[PDB]
């Protein structure tokens, strides 16, 4: 299949800025490139078809150009309702239609450090046999943030699950929650449970822990 | 008859080698694309620059029907913008190819117990093929500095090899009959 | 003006079969090709299948070929997708899309809101709601663990508390179940004096749990 | 799971044509998606690949078997056949139907191995006539008693051709049973014995029946063995 | 036609031993070589394909290696159930002589003397004109055993046949039955019938006997 590569994967901007997205094709797709917009929890919406043709009803601030392998979508003046994810899709190979990975146009704000919180497993849960440790990263920017689970100064891998909220409608910040899940037998074998947090807004990695 | 002779291409008893691929010019006839393009899942069917569900509505200057046989792992090479020994040295489609590529496993027709050494492909060539170029030359390829003078030997290889299609081969080595329809004949 | 409404999505065990529908309006349905496009949770878009305007030609993506089947009824303006032998990799939101028809090639100009198709071998189980008590503001919340399938709705104090509330997307753990967290940052002073109750509702199992969170 | 089972005559006269059938059993499996072949083994000898059916018109036959081999596959009945004409004593063997293992995507071998087999059927090429066996009892006695255990059995004598199957108490008695290979007597008729060791204290209380089955003559005998 | 040569043709190994079977091709077959296990009275069972790939359902103690012309089958920790004949098969080309001659693997075990039983002819057989006398050697090792038919102390020869079972897949023993077939008339002429058994496990020859009429 023809691979469609979008860049950047994510870009920050503010209302009024001019945004330019790039979409590359693994081979020449002539001019059959289409741009779609998708908000979270909503279906995609067609913006441009055939590289440059503006779909009826789409604001004229959107435009596309390019032919062959390099394509471009441009928002001349970013409006508040244009913060979304944008996908390109090639239609040259008509029976093997493929999309790009997408590009997220997020709201640009200042750097904010996360408020890290750790929650030990409850007494109600420990009677079920499983132990869940929850670590919370609250209101940070940008989205890039590393969470490292240490247990008795032993790094934990492949036994936690992360989750990140969408960019907040209030302060344009992100939030993360990681859940360390191990059995009750694995839970008494150790005593210290920590959560190391690396972020752009932290001059040094921050750790929140507790003793069982 | 009035219908375009797609029967003589798809249902031919013998197919050409890929390095000497056959081309059938199809002009001034009526075609039932939707009926003859309604293939079963065991057909590999990819179109480029045109939708199959629209061919019955379009008219073209000429429809070229190219046919040949390759092995299963090389079917992906019969497409625009591909590289490999089949796409570079045997059959090259242009980057702006407008048409469809049809392929189906023909292990029951082109493979022989003792080996069907009748199907050949070009292994060496000094430069890549131009789109739709056919090179049936088998001159001794000079891979070094000394001239070969048509004599085989060291750094002087016969440019062709054989597929030796046997039924015991895996799918990646089994023969596939390929038909490439180029559009530039009204569908009905 | 174009209207596309999907239905028929739900939960299905591996190997079983499921059938979707797509009712169209406000355009000549019988003169446009129709598409199916799916999107896995947190992943991109993947084209599935297309059917001709009259319903005589059908073509499928390789990931679903010989497995899914598309059809249409131009007298009802409804599109169908018969999905047999459903794998876990088939779990996605399935959209039906209209073809623009203005080009020699395919492109999607209007999409429906889609319907969720969850392929798993787990039956509908209610959640277990565990508190997350706090230890210069404080943070507390609820852990909604071991429920199937999606979704669950979590509110705080029956919607009276919304400011500073974060409800995270669920995760699919190895047990085939879902785990979800909901948190809220409250003033640290009013901690042992204010009541905080998360309201967890699991419609697929009809489980409305109200758990009080206290330090 | 695929299961193969041979079925054919155990006795073929010289210069006649051998004709066997293998029936493919499975979970709604189409024999059109696999190859099918035949392998024989003369008694006391190695294995010989007879031939394989791949597609109609694309078959392999062992060249040492000349022009007398034919294999046909019935894809609507899920069974295939073997035809071997102008048979001689060199063709007396146990015949197996096998399925060559489907090759992997990148395999480029000129032959294949056989991953699923049948149970094998014994075909004897001979001019003689079929003869059902006489089943005689080997009664347990003091001479056939070692301590607290006693031996009894059945003598399956004067039959042709091979084989005969012997079970005890309809297969409920398998431990301690010994069914010996048959010896070819000077009369041209085969003869074997089958024994079982039982506790001495059970001889008067437990009934012991050997079940002899000679398929080539459609002969089933159930012989009760009692202490004389 | 490529000829395959297995060595050795027969071997005897103890339980837990490491068994190795070599297969040699007259010319390079790359790696298109298979290994089969055939237990007595059973169809061959495919063990190895592509010289080293193990079939589904085969214990991990079987392994194969080799490339070109010489190949090797290895049985780690030999089990009593592993008593069989093993074949290598080239499949580089569809040609005659595809299987090897085979290697028969016998299980070595401790010496065990046979249990000897003798059976007089039945009344049903005596009323058919013939008289068969059966001598039984039950559960012994090794396979070598000698049976002498004595009729009134007259050693007999040429009027009896022997049969030995294959090695038992549980206790690795053999069993033998010798049948002395006589006409009812010649059987009616003598009184004492006996088979004499010699074996490695018998310090003395064992002789079971009966008297016609007693
Ligand atoms: C090539 O020949 C085959 C027959 O060998 C044709 O296959 C038939 O196609 C029709 C539809 O047009 C089906 O209804 C029949 O069931 C098919 N029969 C078989 C035996 O396959 C095929 O149409 C021919 N193709 C062309 C392009 O002429
Ligand atoms: Cl052979």
């Amino acid at each position: 299949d023809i691979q469609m590569t979008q860049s950047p994967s994510s870009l920050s901007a503010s209302v009024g800025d001019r945004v330019t997205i790039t979409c590359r094709a693994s081979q020449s797709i002539s001019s059959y490139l289409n741009w779609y917009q998708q908000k979270p929890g909503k279906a995609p919406k067609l913006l441009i078809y055939a590289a440059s043709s503006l779909q009826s009803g789409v604001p004229s601030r959107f435009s596309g150009s390019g032919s062959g392998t390099d394509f471009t979508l441009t928002i001349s003046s970013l409006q508040p309702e244009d913060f979304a994810t944008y996908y390109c899709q090639q239609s040259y190979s008509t029976l093997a239609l493929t999309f790009g990975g997408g590009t997220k146009v997020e709201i640009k704000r200042t750097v904010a450090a996360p408020s890290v919180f750790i929650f030990p497993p409850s007494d109600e849960q420990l009677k079920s046999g499983t132990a869940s440790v929850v670590c919370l990263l609250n209101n940070f920017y940008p989205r890039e943030a590393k969470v490292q689970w240490k247990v008795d100064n032993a790094l934990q891998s492949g036994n936690s699950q992360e989750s990140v909220t969408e960019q907040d409608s209030k302060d344009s910040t992100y939030s993360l929650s990681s859940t360390l899940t191990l059995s009750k037998a694995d839970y008494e074998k150790h005593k210290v449970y920590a959560c190391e947090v690396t972020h752009q807004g932290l001059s040094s990695p921050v750790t929140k822990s507790f003793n069982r | 008859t009035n219908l375009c002779p797609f029967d003589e291409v798809f249902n031919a008893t013998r197919f050409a080698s890929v390095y000497a691929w056959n081309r059938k010019r199809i002009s001034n006839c009526v075609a039932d694309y939707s009926v003859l393009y309604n293939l079963a899942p065991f057909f590999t069917f990819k179109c480029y620059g045109v939708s199959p569900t629209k061919l019955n509505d379009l008219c073209f200057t000429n429809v070229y029907a190219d046919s040949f046989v390759i092995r299963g792992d090389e079917v992906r090479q019969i497409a625009p913008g591909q590289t490999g020994n089949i796409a570079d040295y045997n059959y090259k489609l242009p980057d702006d190819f407008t048409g469809c590529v049809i392929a189906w496993n023909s292990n029951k027709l082109d493979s022989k117990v003792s080996g069907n050494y009748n199907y050949l492909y070009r292994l060496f060539r000094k430069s890549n093929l131009k789109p739709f170029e056919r090179d049936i030359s088998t001159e001794i390829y000079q891979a070094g500095n000394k001239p070969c003078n048509g004599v085989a030997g060291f750094n002087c290889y016969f440019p062709l090899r054989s597929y030796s299609f046997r039924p015991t081969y895996g799918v990646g080595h089994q023969p596939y009959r390929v038909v490439v329809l180029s559009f530039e004949v009204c569908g009905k | 003006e174009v209207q596309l409404v999907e239905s028929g999505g739900g939960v299905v065990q591996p190997g079983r079969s499921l059938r979707l529908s797509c009712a169209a309006s406000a355009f000549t349905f019988s003169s446009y090709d129709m598409h199916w496009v799916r999107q896995a949770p947190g992943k991109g878009l993947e084209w599935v299948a297309v059917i001709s305007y009259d319903g005589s030609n059908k073509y499928y993506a390789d990931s679903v070929k010989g497995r899914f089947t598309i059809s249409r009824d131009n007298s009802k303006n409804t599109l169908y997708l018969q999905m047999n032998s459903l794998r876990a990799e088939d779990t996605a939101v399935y959209y039906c899309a209209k073809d623009g028809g203005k080009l020699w090639v395919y492109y999607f100009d209007y999409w429906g809101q889609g319907t969720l198709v969850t392929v798993s071998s787990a039956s509908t189980k209610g959640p277990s709601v565990f508190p997350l008590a706090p230890s210069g503001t404080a943070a507390l919340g609820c852990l909604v663990k071991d429920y199937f399938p999606e979704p669950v709705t979590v509110s705080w104090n029956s919607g009276a508390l919304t400011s500073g509330v974060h409800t995270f997307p669920a995760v699919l753990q190895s047990s085939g179940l879902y785990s979800l967290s909901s948190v809220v940052t409250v003033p640290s002073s009013s901690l042992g004096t204010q009541t905080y109750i998360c309201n967890v509702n699991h419609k697929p199992s009809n489980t409305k749990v109200d758990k009080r969170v206290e330090p | 799971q695929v299961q193969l089972q041979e079925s054919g005559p155990g006795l073929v006269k010289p210069s006649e044509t051998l004709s066997l059938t293998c029936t493919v059993s499975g979970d709604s499996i189409s024999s059109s998606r696999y190859y099918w072949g035949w392998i024989r083994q003369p008694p006391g000898k190695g294995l010989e690949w007879i031939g394989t059916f791949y597609y109609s018109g694309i078959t392999y036959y062992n060249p040492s078997l000349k022009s007398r081999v034919t294999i046909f596959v019935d894809t609507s009945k899920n069974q295939f056949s073997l035809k071997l004409s102008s048979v001689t004593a060199a063709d007396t063997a146990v015949y197996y139907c096998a399925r060559p293992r489907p090759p992997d995507y990148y395999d480029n071998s000129g032959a294949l191995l056989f991953d699923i087999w049948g149970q094998g059927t014994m075909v004897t090429v001979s001019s003689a006539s079929t003869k059902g066996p006489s089943v005689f009892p080997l009664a347990p006695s003091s001479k056939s008693t070692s301590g607290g255990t006693a031996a009894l059995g059945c003598l399956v004598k004067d039959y042709f051709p091979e084989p005969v199957t012997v079970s005890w108490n309809s297969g409920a008695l398998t431990s301690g049973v010994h069914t010996f290979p048959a010896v070819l007597q000077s009369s041209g008729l085969y003869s074997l014995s089958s024994v079982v060791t039982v506790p001495s204290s059970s001889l008067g209380t437990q009934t012991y029946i050997c079940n002899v089955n000679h398929k080539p003559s459609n002969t089933k005998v159930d012989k009760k063995v009692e202490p004389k």
Side-chain angles (χ1 to χ4, degrees), chain A residues 32 34 36 38 42-44 46 49-50 55-56 87 89 91 94-95 97 99 117 119 122 124-125 130 132 134 136 138-139 161-165 170 175-177 179 181, chain C residues 37 39 43 45 47 59 95 102-113 129-133 137 139-140 143 145 163 166-169 171-173 181 183 185 211:
Chain A
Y32 299 119
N34 312 315
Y36 302 88
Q38 186 181 28
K42 291 181 178 178
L46 178 63
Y49 67 94
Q55 176 65 17
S56 304
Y87 297 89
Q89 175 262 322
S91 290
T94 60
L95 298 184
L97 310 172
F99 290 81
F117 304 96
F119 298 90
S122 59
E124 297 178 346
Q125 176 184 8
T130 66
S132 287
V134 183
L136 168 61
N138 185 64
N139 296 130
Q161 307 238 246
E162 271 188 0
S163 187
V164 179
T165 61
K170 299 275 207 59
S175 296
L176 189 154
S177 70
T179 293
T181 287
Chain C
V37 182
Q39 179 178 27
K43 303 293 187 181
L45 301 161
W47 172 75
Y59 308 99
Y95 310 98
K102 302 175 182 178
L103 304 175
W104 285 320
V105 305
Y106 296 132
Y107 70 107
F108 328 104
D109 66 337
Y110 293 95
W111 303 58
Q113 287 310 123
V129 178
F130 301 132
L132 306 175
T137 66
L140 55 91
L143 177 66
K145 187 180 183 61
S163 175
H166 294 112
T167 295
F168 295 87
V171 300
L172 214 180
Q173 46 197 10
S181 301
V183 298
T185 58
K211 184 107 292 179

Side-chain angles (χ1 to χ4, degrees), chain D residues 164-189:
Chain D
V164 295
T165 64
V166 181
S167 70
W168 285 90
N169 292 348
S170 304
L173 174 54
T174 58
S175 175
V177 173
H178 286 135
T179 296
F180 302 85
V183 290
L184 183 58
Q185 297 171 115
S186 59
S187 59
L189 307 179

Side-chain angles (χ1 to χ4, degrees), chain D residues 39 41 45-49 52 54 60 62-64 96 101 104 106-115 117-120 135-141 144-146 149-153 155 157-158 176 178-186 191 193 195 197 223-224 228:
Chain D
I39 305 173
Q41 181 170 43
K45 283 306 164 188
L47 297 163
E48 183 174 44
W49 177 21
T52 45
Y54 300 102
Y60 167 81
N62 191 321
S64 61
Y96 304 90
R101 169 186 176 277
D104 299 334
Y106 294 105
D107 294 0
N108 63 348
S109 74
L112 289 171
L113 42 91
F114 312 86
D115 66 331
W117 300 64
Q119 273 231 96
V135 184
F136 305 112
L138 298 177
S141 179
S144 83
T145 295
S146 294
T149 58
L152 53 95
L155 180 61
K157 183 177 172 59
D158 292 332
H178 286 135
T179 296
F180 302 85
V183 290
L184 183 58
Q185 297 171 115
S186 59
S191 174
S193 55
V195 302
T197 51
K223 201 61 183 185
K224 191 195 305 177
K228 202 210 173 187

Side-chain angles (χ1 to χ4, degrees), chain C residues 30-46:
Chain C
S30 61
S31 66
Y32 285 102
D33 304 330
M34 298 303 300
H35 298 263
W36 281 103
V37 182
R38 68 182 179 182
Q39 179 178 27
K43 303 293 187 181
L45 301 161
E46 179 187 19

Side-chain angles (χ1 to χ4, degrees), chain B residues 6-7 10-11 35-36:
Chain B
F6 294 110
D7 188 304
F10 284 82
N11 270 322
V35 187
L36 294 177

